[PDB]
């Protein structure tokens, strides 16, 4: 990767200055221009920017720094519907107050009641480039920061020489001090005087660095997009949570049975092992609500298929019927990788709807995951939803596949073994698959379970009946 974060020199970057500024009933606005010659340290310095400050509610302040002609990437409205429709707040009626210096350009977010500074870029360069956006805030000595995951570090973030990298990746062992599967650019700032929240609505890769070199600070190193901030005032920890839920939208409600205990394993080789696990829980008087199956159910790890030897439709139906008859539930794994080397419903319908991510030359993008050489759906394609829905409707019907009660989604980063390293280990998809073992040989077909399964049909223990 390198050490760009640690050895970067921004001393030659000129920052910005506000050429003109106007106020509205619930807003502050300013045109920003380079205060000097471009540094172009990590791409091309944008000559001109817009500052947009919306007091949306008394709780939520929107501070947005973007380009002037709406070309820089912004998170689609599709994916993250924005808050503040029909909402506006007179500045003096807001818990948070926005202040700015014109030259050099910096801004402060403060508490309207106490005057306490929550976020302060005073004395720190704004750098806004094609492929690099840098903003740095002062913080109090020994601050208490939470979030900016998904991470596996201390809940209260390290404050000295702490790198926090947000970029979704398949990170086996969920390693500490490394970017993991999810991306949540929200931090809670907890103080004796109250709690507040700082949300960056940016889906680009970024290195956040928290350190106390001279004074305490937090900096964003973002490789694209705009500085799209929501400040939320709390002042209680729950208030910040509630206010952040106004932005994300409140979470969907869960089924009651879902709170029951779930059993899964990667390696459950056939319908016989799944049955035996369920019965062994009941025999040993340990409650079990839901039994799962990983990639083992599939035909040679191909999505929307069943192993016709180890998960044959008839015995798969008998398994799911007995699970349901005992008032238990069944969940199985699905992944985005669609095998393209042989015909299968997901590939065939995939090509027909034409919903696969494509190369410049227009041919479908090639990777390798568990089935072998694979394509990846384009979720932006306007037929991607119908393709996906119809796949589910055709497969999880209790005939072609199991009538599941809930879904497990894995390797949706997306995971692509082929790029180990990029590009494609300097070989073809077919050769990488063979060497890497995608798919591996399933274990030898069994006559049935290794012991009788009390409470399950004869069909799931033919070697014991």
């Amino acid at each position: 990767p390198g050490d760009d974060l640690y050895v970067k020199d921004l001393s030659g970057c000129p920052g910005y200055k506000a050429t003109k500024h106007w106020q509205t009933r619930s807003g502050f606005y300013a045109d920003l221009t380079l205060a000097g010659p471009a540094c172009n340290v990590f791409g091309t310095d944008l000559p001109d920017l817009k500052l947009e400050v919306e007091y949306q509610t008394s709780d939520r302040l929107h501070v947005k720094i973007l380009d002037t002609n709406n070309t820089v990437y912004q998170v689609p409205d599709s994916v993250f519907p924005r808050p503040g429709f029909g909402e506006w707040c007179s500045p003096k009626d807001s818990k948070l107050k926005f202040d700015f210096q014109a030259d050099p350009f910096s801004f402060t977010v403060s508490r309207t009641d106490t005057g306490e500074v929550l976020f302060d870029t005073t004395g720190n360069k704004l750098v806004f480039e094609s492929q690099y956006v840098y903003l740095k805030t002062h913080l109090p000595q020994n601050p208490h920061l939470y979030g900016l995951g998904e991470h596996s570090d201390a809940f209260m973030l390290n404050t000295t020489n702490y790198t926090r990298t947000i970029y979704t990746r398949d990170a086996y062992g969920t390693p500490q001090g490394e970017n993991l599967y999810g991306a949540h650019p929200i931090y809670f700032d907890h103080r004796q005087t109250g709690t507040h929240g700082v949300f960056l609505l940016n889906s680009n890769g970024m290195d956040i660095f928290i350190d106390n070199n001279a004074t305490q600070y937090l900096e964003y190193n973002i490789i694209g997009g705009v500085l799209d901030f929501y400040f939320i005032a709390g002042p209680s920890p729950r208030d910040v949570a509630i206010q952040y839920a106004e932005i994300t939208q409140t979470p969907l409600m869960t089924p009651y049975w879902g709170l029951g205990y779930h059993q899964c394993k990667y390696g459950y080789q056939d319908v016989y092992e799944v049955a035996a696990v369920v019965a062994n829980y009941s025999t040993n008087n340990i409650p079990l609500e839901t039994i799962w199956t990983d990639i083992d159910y599939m035909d040679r790890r191909r999505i929307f298929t069943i192993d016709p030897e180890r998960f044959p439709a008839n015995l798969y139906k008998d398994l799911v019927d007995t699970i349901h008859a005992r008032d238990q539930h069944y969940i199985v794994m699905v992944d985005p990788a669609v095998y393209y080397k042989e015909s299968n419903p997901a590939l065939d319908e995939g090509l027909r709807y034409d919903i696969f991510m494509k190369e410049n030359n227009g041919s479908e993008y090639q990777g390798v995951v568990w089935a072998g050489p694979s394509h990846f759906p384009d979720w932006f394609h306007p037929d991607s939803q119908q393709y996906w829905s119809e796949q589910f409707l055709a497969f999880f019907d209790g005939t072609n596949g199991p009538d599941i009660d809930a879904l497990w989604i894995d390797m949706n980063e997306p995971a692509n073994f082929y790029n180990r390293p990029y590009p494609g280990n300097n070989t073809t998809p077919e050769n990488f698959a063979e060497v890497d073992g995608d798919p591996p040989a399933a274990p030898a077909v069994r006559d049935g379970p290794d012991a009788p399964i009390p409470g399950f049909p004869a069909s799931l223990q033919p070697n014991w009946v």
């Binding site: 208490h144 990746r169 086996y172 390693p175 939208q249 409600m253 089924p255 029951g260 394993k265 996906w388």
Partner: protein
């Protein structure tokens, strides 16, 4: 039908939505971006950019994922929307699950997410390892999702995905696992079997943990509903409950299951002792209900059996519990209620109980029940539209210093300062019950 009868009591204030004000940005979208706008600048290095992030996967943005130069429908490039691929698959899968069962809430446990994914999908913390470190950091991670990221249903692989788990670590994980909003044992293909029945100690540790969990299932179901309603979190760091106590600020080896249940697991490998912080408040031991006065100081318990976990009730809260656990949640819903009153320092207690059909996305009938206890009296207000076919069988009041005069339908445990009052109160309408 979809009447949603008796709902809306716990929603937060809907801010003044002046419709003709529209967006302040003056545009037709919240982004201020038209449908052919904000797609990204051209002439960019999309595989290996000029500033490269500390990517653990490798030297490019493409290592162990999809090439970051790929142009998607609408002109979006993977460089920009990569962090949303997890979220957008998850969204598409949710809708697909809804297509095949349109009336049911779709439960989706997904790996990769982005901010806002809470609104349509739940999370598991991916491929951890059967080690004490992954058990330790699990609490940092559930708090991240439930408390910060608005994804309240979250858990790791209980007893660890990779490696071979020991009897002791799995017994420990089984008890801690019982206080995750998502509770799931999962393991790697070359890992030895680690179902709870494989070890007697792990099996009994599970029986203990699942029993407590299932007693509190409606309690956590209510917390997740309130989060669904207002965004108030179903798991709370200690500082969420004690914001003015700096000792709680860095604590990530304890958490609140809902608002009131303090989970203080044994964290140290091959140990039966735990050092844990009790805030300056009244607490009550789980099961016994024995008062424990926290002093805003660390306390040390020794001889914590590998089948056991230290759990306290926070004072000032009413805990609605199923009188018993059961082998299925279908059986659990047929058990009566034990309303456990844990008075605060002011002798008062507050708590809610949400009841519905447990499955439907838009309920026909709901019971949004509020409980208030003060001056020996339990008041039950709210809505009661859901036919539960079960009522309150016991009202337990904790911190009763002395046995009361009358001995009508009341047991007093003098050792544990606990009163139990036998009753038969249906959840069909508001009610008042005198205990003391």
């Amino acid at each position: 039908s979809r009447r949603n009868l008796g709902a809306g009591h716990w929603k937060s204030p809907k801010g003044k939505v002046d419709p003709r004000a529209g967006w302040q940005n003056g545009k037709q979208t919240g982004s201020g971006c038209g449908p052919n706008e904000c797609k990204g600048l051209p002439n960019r290095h999309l595989i290996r950019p000029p500033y490269m992030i500390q990517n653990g996967a490798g030297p490019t943005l493409a290592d162990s994922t999809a090439d970051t130069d790929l142009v998607q429908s609408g002109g979006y490039v993977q460089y920009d929307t990569h962090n949303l691929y997890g979220a957008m698959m998850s969204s598409h899968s949710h809708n697909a699950m809804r297509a095949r069962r349109p009336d049911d809430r779709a439960l989706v446990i997904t790996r990769s997410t982005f901010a806002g994914s809470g609104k349509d999908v739940s999370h598991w913390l991916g491929d951890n390892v059967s080690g004490w470190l992954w058990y330790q950091l699990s609490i940092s991670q559930i708090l991240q999702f439930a408390s910060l990221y608005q994804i309240p249903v979250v858990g790791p692989d209980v007893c660890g995905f990779g490696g071979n788990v020991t009897e002791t670590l799995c017994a420990r994980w089984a008890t801690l696992g019982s206080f995750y909003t998502f509770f799931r044992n999962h393991a790697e293909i070359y890992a030895n079997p680690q179902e709870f029945y494989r070890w007697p100690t792990v099996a009994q540790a599970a029986r203990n943990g699942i029993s407590i969990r299932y007693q509190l299932l409606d309690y956590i179901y209510t917390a997740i509903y309130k989060q669904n309603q207002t965004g108030t979190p179903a798991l709370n760091p200690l500082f969420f409950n004690y914001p003015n106590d700096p000792n709680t600020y860095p604590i990530d080896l304890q958490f609140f299951y809902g608002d009131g249940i303090l989970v203080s697991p044994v964290t140290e490998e091959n140990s039966t002792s735990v050092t844990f912080y009790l805030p300056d408040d009244i607490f009550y031991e789980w099961g016994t209900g024995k008062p424990v006065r926290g002093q805003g100081e660390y306390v040390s318990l020794d001889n914590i059996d590998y089948t056991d976990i230290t759990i306290h009730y926070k004072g000032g809260i009413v805990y609605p519990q199923r009188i018993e656990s059961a082998n299925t949640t279908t059986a659990l819903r047929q058990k009566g209620f034990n309303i456990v009153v844990a008075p605060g320092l002011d002798g008062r207690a507050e708590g809610s109980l949400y009841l519905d059909d447990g499955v439907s996305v838009v309920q026909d009938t709901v019971s949004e029940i509020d409980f208030v206890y003060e001056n020996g009296k339990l008041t039950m207000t709210g809505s009661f539209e859901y036919e539960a076919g079960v009522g309150i069988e016991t009202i337990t009041v904790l911190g009763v210093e002395s046995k009361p005069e009358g001995d009508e339908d009341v047991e007093y445990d003098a050792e544990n300062k606990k009163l139990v009052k036998h009753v038969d109160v249906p959840l069909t309408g508001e009610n008042e019950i005198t205990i003391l």
